[PDB]
């Protein structure tokens, strides 16, 4: 009739992996123990210089790790002689990850001496009309319970409400804010998380810019934009996630700041004097994520990625992984009293300068299965149609051309050695692959292979079978 229908269908996408036959060769890797000691509210800076003393690194902002893995294609192996570069390729698939959080319990305590607060509104105790001048208070807060983790192999997409349409393309005033329109963009390391007021920008969305704890008074806040990644017909943005989260209202409070909103006043029959006047309606709930418990860990636990949950079966492309972690239960603050100098005949608040630190621990334990790719000319035709770039990077076909063409003469320096001629002063640039910042994790020398050794290893080896078990554990009775 229309007809239309789409007709019927035009083209359609086959599974990513359904010709990739896994091999019995495994390799293994681990992590030494990554370390940062940051400060959660603000990077503590040098007092006459731009550059950090303590960086803002915390579990309350996204921890995005770029993990870059060995070339599997050319890699150390014990017996291979099947391999034909044109009719087969190799690729890593990681068959498990555990992530050790070596930090003890302890949340990220954050607060502002000047948090925007007018009156109590939970049970309340007074009335007030429109706001006076200067109603902010010293209040501190714990952020809502949020733990998630996601594993991908291409940076993942966040959403946030950004700064949308202007004041002139609507009829919304300056003092009422340009509209909040959901602007989607990739999650970057050092980006703040969802705050319990929604996940939004707060740089240009707080003109007071001291409504909330210091950390979130600037920068974008994101929430993972699961709908785009999972409706993706390739699903390389992610392919594994899990989360446990909750929030509750500690207490309702009202913002300070004059109503700019439109309250029709002829929807209540007038009081007398004070109750004929109109209060602030600028309610905000304060979130809480209190009661930490160690049966609420989504961490610390192996997740065998024999298959993924995406539309990608976890088989790497570009040989890299992205691991985004928020952990609010581990982001522990520390206390101690330190004297600036000795002069204490008594305790003095003067002399004893308290200073908080934050300790952030990460360790990543990996077990990799090697996989082969069966390829023929017809299959390849399809592989390029999905992603040109994967074949071109592997370049066991193809060509981009080998090279060639020259290597020489000669670069750089030029001269070397002895020389130190001129020094030579630069000479830019060579040669970076970044566009986003990421906490680099090199795995290209952490490679090992044993599964009778390494704890993570052993649980995988037992789960399988002979050779070898018992090699423990197992239990861990009772």
């Amino acid at each position, epitope marked *: 009739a229309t007809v239309y229908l789409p007709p019927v269908p035009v083209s359609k996408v086959v599974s990513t992996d359904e010709y990739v036959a896994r091999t019995n060769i495994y390799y293994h890797a681990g992590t030494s123990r990554l370390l940062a000691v940051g400060h959660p509210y603000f990077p503590i800076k040098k007092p006459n210089n731009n550059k950090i003393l303590v960086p803002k690194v915390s579990g309350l902002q996204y921890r995005v790790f770029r993990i870059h893995l060995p070339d599997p294609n050319k890699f150390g192996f014990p017996d291979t002689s099947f391999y034909n570069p044109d009719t087969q390729r190799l690729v890593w698939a990681c068959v498990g990850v555990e992530v050790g959080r070596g930090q003890p319990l302890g949340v990220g305590i954050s607060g502002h001496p000047l948090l925007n607060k007018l009156d109590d509104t939970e049970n309340a105790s007074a009335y007030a009309a429109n706001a006076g001048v200067d109603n902010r208070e010293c209040i501190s807060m714990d952020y809502k319970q949020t733990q998630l983790c996601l594993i991908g192999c291409k940076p993942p997409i966040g959403e946030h409400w*950004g*700064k949308g349409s202007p004041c002139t*393309q609507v009829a919304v005033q300056p003092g009422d804010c340009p509209p909040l329109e959901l602007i*989607n963009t990739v999650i970057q390391d050092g980006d703040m998380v969802d705050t319990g007021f929604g996940a939004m920008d707060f*740089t240009t969305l707080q*003109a007071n810019k001291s409504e909330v704890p210091l950390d979130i008074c600037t*920068s974008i806040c994101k929430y993972p934009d699961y709908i785009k990644m999972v409706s993706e017909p390739y699903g390389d943005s992610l392919f594994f996630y899990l989360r446990r989260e909750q929030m509750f209202v500690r207490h309702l409070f009202n913002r300070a700041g004059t109503v700019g909103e439109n309250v029709p006043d002829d929807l209540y029959i007038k009081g007398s004097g004070s109750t004929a006047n109109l209060a602030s309606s600028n309610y905000f709930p304060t979130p809480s994520g209190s009661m930490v418990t160690s049966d609420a860990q989504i961490f610390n636990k192996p997740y065998w990625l024999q298959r993924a949950q995406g539309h990608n079966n976890g088989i790497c492309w570009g040989n890299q992984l992205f691991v985004t972690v928020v952990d609010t239960t581990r982001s522990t603050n520390m206390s101690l009293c330190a004297a600036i100098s000795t002069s204490e005949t008594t305790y003095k608040n003067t002399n004893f300068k308290e200073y908080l630190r934050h300790g952030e621990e990460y360790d990543l334990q990996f077990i990799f299965q090697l996989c082969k790719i069966t390829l023929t000319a017809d299959v390849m035709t399809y592989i390029h149609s999905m992603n040109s770039t994967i074949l071109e990077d592997w370049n066991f076909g193809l060509q981009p051309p080998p090279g060639g063409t020259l290597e020489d003469t000669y670069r750089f320096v030029t001269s070397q050695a002895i020389a130190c001629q001129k020094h030579t002063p630069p000479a*830019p*640039k060579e040669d970076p692959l970044k566009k986003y910042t990421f906490w680099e994790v090199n795995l290209k020398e952490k490679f090992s292979a044993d599964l009778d050794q390494f704890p993570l290893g052993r649980k995988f080896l037992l789960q399988l079978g002979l050779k070898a078990k018992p090699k423990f554990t197992l239990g861990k009775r009772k």
Partner: antibody
Amino acid sequence: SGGGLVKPGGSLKLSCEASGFTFSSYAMSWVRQTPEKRLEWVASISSGGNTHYPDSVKGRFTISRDNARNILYLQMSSLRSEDTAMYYCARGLYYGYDEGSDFDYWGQGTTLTVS
Amino acid sequence: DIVMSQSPSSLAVSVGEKVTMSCKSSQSLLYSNTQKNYLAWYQQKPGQSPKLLIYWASTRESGVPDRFTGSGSGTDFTLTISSVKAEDLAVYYCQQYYSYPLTFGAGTKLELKR
């Protein structure tokens, strides 16, 4: 603000003060015009403080922002005669509806002569 | 860096004529993954600073006359003025904001015949 005559090898610090809009909400950017009349990207800095420079000035020019006073800076060092140009301060805009970027506003420019 | 090549270097037309001008990039400005083109066009009148015309390859900035249309995809882009007016004499630039360094074309100078 801040251009003028400077000898080769010297240093110079340019400033750009914003007005009429929310400075903290926009990326700011430096663009120069050499006598040949073609625009050349000088440096950019993200709202989060990540700097970006081309090889022509990387290691010599530094871009920075004062978020409190709303001032954009461009510290130049080891100036070369080839750096002679009109330098422009400019904003950047992100358009979420199309996921793109442009330079919506820029100043009158200040002239820098290395001679 | 991505080299932006504009053509012709200049052209002269009378009031009412249609003009087209080329901007070709040395690398693709089409992000395969989302199919967006990262291209903007600017207009610099004599004695003035460049004004934004087109961005995201084909999106016209508010206040720009509808006679200016930007088109193209990938590496080959065009700016068309459907009917040139006397006030359109200027140097037209194109600029890629796909990757760093952010780079500009050489410009096309439009002059008026009378």
